[PDB]
Write an enzyme that holds these catalytic residues in place. Structure first.
Site, PDB file in Angstrom:
ATOM      1  N   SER B 570       0.825  -1.217   0.000  1.00  0.00           N
ATOM      2  CA  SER B 570       0.000   0.000   0.000  1.00  0.00           C
ATOM      3  C   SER B 570       0.853   1.258   0.000  1.00  0.00           C
ATOM      4  O   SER B 570       1.837   1.354   0.744  1.00  0.00           O
ATOM      5  CB  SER B 570      -0.857   0.077   1.256  1.00  0.00           C
ATOM      6  OG  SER B 570      -1.712   1.219   1.064  1.00  0.00           O
ATOM      7  N   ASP B 607      15.086  29.639  10.288  1.00  0.00           N
ATOM      8  CA  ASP B 607      15.674  28.289  10.608  1.00  0.00           C
ATOM      9  C   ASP B 607      14.742  27.199  10.114  1.00  0.00           C
ATOM     10  O   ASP B 607      15.227  26.171   9.617  1.00  0.00           O
ATOM     11  CB  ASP B 607      15.924  28.147  12.094  1.00  0.00           C
ATOM     12  CG  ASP B 607      17.141  28.932  12.596  1.00  0.00           C
ATOM     13  OD1 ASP B 607      17.892  29.493  11.745  1.00  0.00           O
ATOM     14  OD2 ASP B 607      17.374  28.871  13.836  1.00  0.00           O
ATOM     15  N   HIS B 630      19.658  11.742   1.009  1.00  0.00           N
ATOM     16  CA  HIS B 630      18.407  12.517   0.788  1.00  0.00           C
ATOM     17  C   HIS B 630      17.354  11.473   0.348  1.00  0.00           C
ATOM     18  O   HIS B 630      17.616  10.639  -0.541  1.00  0.00           O
ATOM     19  CB  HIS B 630      18.640  13.518  -0.334  1.00  0.00           C
ATOM     20  CG  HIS B 630      17.640  14.634  -0.362  1.00  0.00           C
ATOM     21  ND1 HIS B 630      16.300  14.478  -0.696  1.00  0.00           N
ATOM     22  CD2 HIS B 630      17.840  15.956  -0.165  1.00  0.00           C
ATOM     23  CE1 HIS B 630      15.702  15.666  -0.631  1.00  0.00           C
ATOM     24  NE2 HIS B 630      16.617  16.589  -0.344  1.00  0.00           N
TER      25      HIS B 630
END
Ligand SMILES: *[C@@H]1O[C@H](CO)[C@@H](O[C@@H]2O[C@H](CO)[C@@H](O[C@@H]3O[C@H](CO)[C@@H](O)[C@H](O[C@H]4O[C@H](CO)[C@@H](O)[C@H](O)[C@@H]4O)[C@@H]3O)[C@H](O)[C@H]2NC(C)=O)[C@H](O)[C@H]1NC(C)=O
Ligand SMILES: *[C@@H]1O[C@H](CO)[C@@H](O[C@@H]2O[C@H](CO)[C@@H](O[C@@H]3O[C@H](CO)[C@@H](O)[C@H](O[C@H]4O[C@H](CO)[C@@H](O)[C@H](O)[C@@H]4O)[C@@H]3O)[C@H](O)[C@H]2NC(C)=O)[C@H](O)[C@H]1NC(C)=O
Ligand SMILES: *[C@@H]1O[C@H](CO)[C@@H](O[C@@H]2O[C@H](CO)[C@@H](O[C@@H]3O[C@H](CO)[C@@H](O)[C@H](O)[C@@H]3O)[C@H](O)[C@H]2NC(C)=O)[C@H](O)[C@H]1NC(C)=O
Ligand SMILES: *[C@@H]1O[C@H](CO)[C@@H](O[C@@H]2O[C@H](CO)[C@@H](O[C@@H]3O[C@H](CO)[C@@H](O)[C@H](O)[C@@H]3O)[C@H](O)[C@H]2NC(C)=O)[C@H](O)[C@H]1NC(C)=O
Ligand SMILES: *[C@@H]1O[C@H](CO)[C@@H](O[C@@H]2O[C@H](CO)[C@@H](O)[C@H](O)[C@H]2NC(C)=O)[C@H](O)[C@H]1NC(C)=O
Ligand SMILES: *[C@@H]1O[C@H](CO)[C@@H](O[C@@H]2O[C@H](CO)[C@@H](O)[C@H](O)[C@H]2NC(C)=O)[C@H](O)[C@H]1NC(C)=O
Ligand SMILES: *[C@@H]1O[C@H](CO)[C@@H](O[C@@H]2O[C@H](CO)[C@@H](O)[C@H](O)[C@H]2NC(C)=O)[C@H](O)[C@H]1NC(C)=O
Ligand SMILES: *[C@@H]1O[C@H](CO)[C@@H](O[C@@H]2O[C@H](CO)[C@@H](O)[C@H](O)[C@H]2NC(C)=O)[C@H](O)[C@H]1NC(C)=O
Ligand SMILES: *[C@@H]1O[C@H](CO)[C@@H](O)[C@H](O)[C@H]1NC(C)=O
Ligand SMILES: *[C@@H]1O[C@H](CO)[C@@H](O)[C@H](O)[C@H]1NC(C)=O
Ligand SMILES: *[C@@H]1O[C@H](CO)[C@@H](O)[C@H](O)[C@H]1NC(C)=O
Ligand SMILES: *[C@@H]1O[C@H](CO)[C@@H](O)[C@H](O)[C@H]1NC(C)=O
Ligand SMILES: *[C@@H]1O[C@H](CO)[C@@H](O)[C@H](O)[C@H]1NC(C)=O
Ligand SMILES: *[C@@H]1O[C@H](CO)[C@@H](O)[C@H](O)[C@H]1NC(C)=O
Ligand SMILES: O=C(O)CC[C@H](CP(=O)(O)O)C(=O)O
Ligand SMILES: O=C(O)CC[C@H](CP(=O)(O)O)C(=O)O
Ligand SMILES: [Ca+2]
Ligand SMILES: [Ca+2]
Ligand SMILES: [Cl-]
Ligand SMILES: [Cl-]
Ligand SMILES: [Zn+2]
Ligand SMILES: [Zn+2]
Ligand SMILES: [Zn+2]
Ligand SMILES: [Zn+2]
Lengths: 691, 691
Positions: B570, B607, B630
């Site tokens: 899923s 930030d 990443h």
């Protein structure tokens, strides 16, 4: 005024007492309905006390429980297959609790199932050096044997890993009165000693910081992908069970084979402490048989997370956290800590209702499943890691407030040394004979620093409690403080059914003055960290210890001068980095005292202080321990409870004379020196001028 | 006034031209004296231009060079052992440079030595799908064969890894005129096409982001511990050498065995493009022999690092970096980029001499050894990782400013899309027929977004240039911009001796107007990132692409509906996370537009914007690629130059129908969906209210 004195004065011994009683009437085992009920109670109360938000954070983690209808026990069996002696199925319950339901019988959490039958070998505390002695000196082979070890000295998971690597097919853990029965004190309920039927529960995992065994790296949320059991982290491969000393006597008394090698191997029972293997003469055909039927089951756990939002820097977090789950009643562990957190939340909430807010945000946590491997704190830190590593100022733990009544015990990062010294100089000693004197004075008198005259001892952080993910994985400055006895073994009733409210009220702290003092230390530290304009960290204290740790690791290496010559093993880079760190820290401190009204320079400087602990994190982790990422400190590979300094170099040097390829082994020492020198220099450079 | 218009107006085409001429008169190969001399020149000039500090940062890294007295070449050898044809020992030098010393002959950097002799197999572009076609469809076995492949389409290191995994014992790379000779354009020196003697240099490593092969994770400083060569990262195991199409024709013309499977396998030479193995009829006893004698050698490299300190937020860094090392003269690559950086530094320095400073610190970098695997940028980022991940706002790359003269080409994080759109609407188009129109108008007309009407195409970042460590390892928002042709193959003279100042001045950009436009885009982006009060990132743009990438990866999976049913695969959690990110980003944007005069809320919010790219970093990295961290983007596993979205899920799905244990393979797809959904949700939560 709303200052730290107002906060401290609001704390009351009688409230801590009331909360401890309230938290210890029924068992609060992780994953049980009673524990979920208590979580909901604490959530409601922290809201009424005044916190801005209070939420439950739940996770579905691997826990372990005995089978209610197939109990665990150990036998001595004769050659006919008759079980002629059986260990107890439960601890005799304490007075007035003999009708309490749902007391979990003694077991070793996460033991696999099995019914191994064999000859016993006695392995003392089952430390690395105990197995070295058995195997290398005494030429005793544990392979295929059941090992019996006394609790004490090191974390029980380390004992089991050592036994497993020795080839044992099972481990019996027991409490020897040498370690758990103080001379001249009565057994519970008439004193604070362990009776012969008492037994220490506890998990035997070797998680190395992973958290839930099925979801390392990621929170065990609703859509989590889990490892299969066969790939789980940290589970033991052989059955393990703990027993009391009445039962241990019956197992040890028939032991034959070799005499103990020296007196450090003998406890206080009326037995020879023979190492075995197996029993003497007439009993040599008898064997020991374990019957373990516990099951591991994914079970929901609940952390309570309370927020008091900061007025000025709400995106900076000071965390006070400790666990709520207990093995049985948790009279000391953890509810003596949890009652103190509850009173601290109440006190901060009183100031808040009057219009005060702390400068920075304070988060308060009631962690679940600590007893099963720091699961609640670790899963929550895994879920919130990005927020914590960019915003986390400090973590103060809050497990058991007392484990004795003698003096304070503090373990923390060097960044907190000055804070702790200054705070304790402002607090009253609760100690008899120190009326009108400071806590710093009594503590320094009773627990002198081994290094400096007129200063107290402060220990390193390892693991074995909920600060571990924050400090060792994420590099957030962390500390803990408690009252202690006159070190790694635990007090006599640790993790036993006898750890009750009455134990504390009668024998440890009748006036709750030690609990109050610990609330002042923990709460005072949180107040200062959350409210001081400049964060109360002194980087110069890190420079001092780094030199001490560099000298120490060099001294270990220098036990092998020929190899250091042959393989050109130099510590020059590490001493250079430490010298540079010392120089840069001194210059940073001058700027911190001198800098200008300028809130960007202040926060610039506050971020330098906050990220200094963070700079000791290596994103590649330590060898084969990816979740231990701090290069200066890690839990000892031989004892999770102890901190080790320069752990990567320490483990590369450990037992190096026994390695078969010395070139490779000394190469790895040199690699670890490189990593450590680079990390110290990189941390130093975070305190240089930014541009 | 000192605003962006003042900065942009100071940039001059004639200065860029002067600097390009100055940088391209002699070769600047990494590790050579000439390259160190240029580093010192740039350091001196950046100081005179006005920067606050300019330092060299040096490292000792593994480089590779041919042997000056034992040249590399390929032969056809007859059955008697006679070499009857030999490839060239050097490219014919261009006019007026036939007396230049120290032109490195064509070679494949990091090839091992060897003299393998065998039968040729032609493998088209040596892509994953080309080897699938050969092995699975054509039943051709590359084991023990020498493979000949045309350059183009994917990074050459990927070709070599594919050939190695096919069992090849050597690889010959060549430039086919189909890919490197534009119809109707003359060969250098009379046009911009590749002559038949031209050859593309380049490294063939598969570093996956590691940097120097001997020191992964840590900078290659003076005390660095190095891996042995046998444990180095990324080195190929078979010899490799590149050749021009005159030489390729001689190797391909005798090829026999199977016909090419279709026209996409035929280039433009007058040969059949038979796949082999080996030669036709009469020549079947001839073989191909390589002679490679290159050596790998640890060599010093030098980055130049210039600092312009910020007036208000000096602890926030905006970095403009590009490389300085070249294969030969570097007329386009990299000096067309380096000349643009030089003029940008000069322009910022002019404002600085008048009393201006940027709000945030700007760092300028001239990286070394890019051509040998991004070594200079990666080692410096490894040394400074703690500073960069707590302080790095953005990285703008600056390799080749032009690779054509047709339109702009931008690749960047979604966080920069709005910045790039707004900036290009304020810049003049340099394009013929767009006089008086904006750069946004010309770019959008020539390079339309495949998705949105009236918007330009912006591509994803993969790797193959110096932004990779900043974006893929550290999660700092990164971008790049250049002028391009009408994609992964390179322009015809790429990495050839013919890439000279004259090539650029005569054929690419005689008026230096395209260079000027690129300086305005790169410099304008740096100006805005360093000076805007609120960082110029729009988190809503990330939400839009995350939905696109989720739809894309779901669509790949849905090619296997039965397996998704069987293994309960899923994507619900990932779409939920993307929906949550969209909702939270929208709310954050409202607060950013509404928030109060309050510099803490501003910096709090700055930030949040800065750490948003950081939140997509997974500290455990991608599977078997620990330096690609990443979760949204990674360089394609089949082509380092291309970016891939949701790479962990993409690689788990790739060729899944061929996996022998589908349960395990689909389990890993589910694990990657979990990791991606968790990471998107965690990144979203960094934009929630902080407390
Ligand atoms: C602690 O801080 C100090 C700074 O105060 C820092 O000093 C640096 O030490 C390095 C390593 O010794 C120096 O590196 C030298 O740099 C010069 C160029 O400036 C090079 O020419 C040198 O290389 C030559 O000599 C080497 C040694 O014999 C040879 O191996 C080499 O092949 C060359 O012949 C050398 O790289 C550096 O200059 C200083 N930097 C300063 C003073 O600013 C020290 O490194 C810090 N400690 C740690 C652990 O980081
Ligand atoms: C996107 O954001 C939304 C918030 O708007 C967030 O919603 C959360 O979803 C989780 C997962 O569905 C919810 O978890 C539930 O929490 C309740 C307690 O509040 C539990 O009782 C539920 O467990 C029961 O039901 C489960 C499903 O049938 C059973 O598996 C389980 O055994 C229990 O019977 C369940 O854990 C959570 O309440 C909301 N939080 C909200 C609305 O605040 C969603 O998770 C976000 N998406 C992602 C990918 O993070
Ligand atoms: C623990 O308490 C000690 C003792 O008060 C604190 O150290 C003291 O800190 C103050 C404030 O920085 C220092 O005062 C400064 O003096 C310098 C030079 O005289 C001056 O330039 C500054 O304007 C400022 O007044 C003081 O010197 C210092 N004392 C010592 C012995 O170091 C310490 O900071 C506390 N630790 C914490 C809060 O973590
Ligand atoms: C790219 O340029 C666009 C167009 O100027 C910028 O978007 C615009 O940004 C301004 C400033 O935030 C928005 O103005 C605001 O309007 C709201 C409501 O009307 C008000 O509450 C604020 O006080 C403020 O005036 C403007 O709406 C917005 N326009 C659009 C179409 O979004 C955009 O920010 C630039 N992108 C950057 C700088 O990264
Ligand atoms: C522990 O204290 C809590 C809080 O006072 C008690 O819980 C309350 O019990 C009363 C009476 O049963 C209820 O009306 C409240 O709703 C409860 N409040 C909350 C917040 O739960 C609890 O009874 C005490 N437990 C023990 C063992 O004394
Ligand atoms: C120790 O416990 C075992 C298990 O309950 C006892 O052995 C059982 O005794 C019953 C009744 O005599 C037998 O029918 C079972 O077959 C036995 N089970 C096993 C596994 O042997 C045993 O008697 C107990 N020993 C002592 C000394 O109390
Ligand atoms: C590239 O330009 C630089 C800078 O103008 C030239 O280097 C200068 O050369 C003069 C004359 O030789 C010297 O007096 C200066 O000391 C040099 N300056 C610096 C900073 O190096 C260099 O000659 C030019 N190179 C080429 C090929 O034209
Ligand atoms: C290709 O190059 C090789 C290497 O230089 C040439 O072969 C050499 O020729 C000399 C002089 O005839 C011999 O003495 C060497 O023994 C040869 N070396 C080898 C390795 O065979 C060869 O003649 C060249 N072929 C062509 C067609 O030019
Ligand atoms: C526990 O033991 C009972 C009784 O022997 C058995 O039927 C059941 O399978 C066991 N329960 C679990 C959870 O293993
Ligand atoms: C210990 O005994 C086991 C079981 O027979 C054997 O396989 C192992 O090699 C022995 N180890 C030593 C050190 O004697
Ligand atoms: C409390 O302190 C007294 C006096 O030193 C001691 O006799 C008593 O045993 C202590 N109680 C505990 C639990 O340590
Ligand atoms: C290069 O080749 C020469 C001449 O054959 C040889 O003597 C030398 O060993 C080689 N140099 C290197 C660096 O391998
Ligand atoms: C290709 O040939 C090699 C060398 O004989 C052989 O070992 C290998 O199994 C072959 N592979 C296939 C797929 O035929
Ligand atoms: C420059 O543009 C013109 C016109 O489109 C074209 O004919 C010429 O070849 C271009 N030069 C290069 C190097 O692409
Ligand atoms: O699993 C750990 O690392 C620690 C669990 C727990 C900590 P506590 O017993 O509550 O002191 C223990 O030591 O058994
Ligand atoms: O090694 C890389 O990842 C890239 C090196 C270099 C980048 P550039 O050639 O300078 O475009 C190349 O692609 O050969
Ligand atoms: Ca987990
Ligand atoms: Ca490195
Ligand atoms: Cl604690
Ligand atoms: Cl670029
Ligand atoms: Zn505890
Ligand atoms: Zn405990
Ligand atoms: Zn380049
Ligand atoms: Zn290049």
């Amino acid at each position: 005024k709303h200052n730290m004195k107002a906060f401290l004065d609001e704390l009351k011994a009688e409230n801590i007492k009331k909360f401890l009683y309230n938290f210890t009437q029924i068992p609060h085992l992780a994953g049980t309905e009673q524990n979920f009920q208590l979580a909901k109670q604490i959530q409601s109360q922290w809201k009424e006390f005044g916190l801005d938000s209070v939420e439950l954070a739940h996770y579905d983690v691997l826990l372990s429980y005995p089978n209610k209808t197939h109990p665990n026990y150990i036998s001595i069996i004769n050659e006919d297959g008759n079980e002629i002696f059986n260990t107890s199925l439960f601890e005799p319950p304490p007075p007035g609790y003999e009708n309490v339901s749902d007391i979990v019988p003694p077991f070793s959490a996460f033991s696999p199932q099995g019914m191994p039958e064999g000859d016993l070998v006695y392995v003392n505390y089952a430390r690395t050096e105990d197995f070295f002695k058995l195997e290398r000196d005494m030429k005793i082979n544990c392979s295929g044997k059941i090992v019996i070890a006394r609790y004490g000295k090191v974390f029980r998971g380390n004992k089991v890993k050592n036994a497993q690597l020795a080839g044992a097919k099972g481990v019996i853990l027991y409490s020897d009165p040498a370690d758990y029965f103080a001379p001249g004190v009565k057994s519970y309920p008439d004193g604070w000693n362990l009776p012969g039927g008492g037994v220490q529960r506890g998990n035997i995992l070797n998680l190395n910081g992973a958290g839930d065994p099925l979801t390392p790296g990621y929170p065990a949320n609703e859509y989590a992908y889990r490892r299969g059991i066969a790939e789980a982290v940290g589970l033991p491969s052989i059955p393990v069970h703990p027993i009391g000393y009445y039962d241990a006597q019956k197992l040890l008394e028939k032991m034959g084979g070799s005499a103990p090698p020296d007196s450090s191997w003998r406890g206080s029972l009326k037995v020879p402490y023979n190492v075995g293997p197996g029993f003497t003469g007439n009993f040599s055909t008898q064997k020991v048989k374990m019957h373990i039927h516990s099951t591991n089951e994914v079970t929901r756990i609940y952390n309570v997370i309370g927020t008091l939002r900061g007025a000025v820097e709400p995106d900076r977090y000071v965390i006070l956290g400790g666990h709520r789950d207990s093995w049985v009643f948790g009279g000391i562990d953890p509810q003596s800590g949890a009652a103190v957190v509850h009173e601290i939340v109440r006190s901060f909430g009183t100031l808040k209702k009057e219009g005060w807010r702390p400068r920075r945000t304070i988060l308060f946590a009631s962690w679940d499943a600590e007893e099963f491997g720091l699961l609640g704190s670790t899963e929550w830190a895994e879920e919130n890691s990005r927020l914590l590593q960019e915003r986390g100022v400090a973590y103060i733990n809050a497990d058991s407030s007392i484990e004795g009544n003698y003096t304070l015990r503090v373990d923390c990062t060097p960044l907190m040394y000055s804070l702790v010294h200054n705070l304790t100089k402002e607090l009253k000693s609760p100690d008899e004979g120190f009326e009108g004197k400071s806590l710093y004075e009594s503590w320094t008198k009773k627990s002198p620093s081994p290094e400096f005259s007129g200063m107290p001892r402060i220990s390193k952080l390892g693991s074995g409690n909920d600060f571990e993910v924050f400090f060792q994985r994420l590099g957030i400055a962390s500390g803990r403080a408690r009252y202690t006895k006159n070190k790694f073994s635990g007090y006599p009733l640790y993790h036993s059914v006898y750890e009750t409210y009455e134990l504390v009220e009668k024998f440890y702290d009748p006036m709750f003055k030690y609990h109050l003092t610990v609330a002042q230390v923990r709460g005072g530290m949180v107040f200062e960290l959350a409210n001081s304009i400049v964060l109360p960290f002194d980087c110069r204290d890190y420079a001092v210890v780094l030199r001490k740790y560099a000298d120490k690791i060099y001294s270990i290496s220098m036990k092998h001068p020929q190899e250091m010559k042959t393989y050109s093993v130099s510590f020059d880079s590490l001493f250079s980095a430490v010298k540079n760190f010392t120089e840069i820290a001194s210059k940073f401190s001058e700027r911190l005292q001198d800098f200008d009204s300028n809130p960007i320079v202040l926060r610039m400087m506050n971020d330098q202080l906050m990220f200094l602990e963070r700079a000791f994190i290596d994103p590649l982790g330590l060898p084969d321990r990816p979740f231990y990422r701090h290069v200066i400190y890690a839990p000892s590979s031989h004892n999770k409870y102890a901190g080790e300094s320069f752990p990567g170099i320490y483990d590369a040097l450990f037992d190096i004379e026994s390695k078969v390829d010395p070139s490779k082994a000394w190469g790895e020492v040199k690699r670890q020196i490189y990593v450590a020198a680079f990390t110290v220099q990189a941390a130093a450079e975070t305190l240089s001028e930014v541009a």
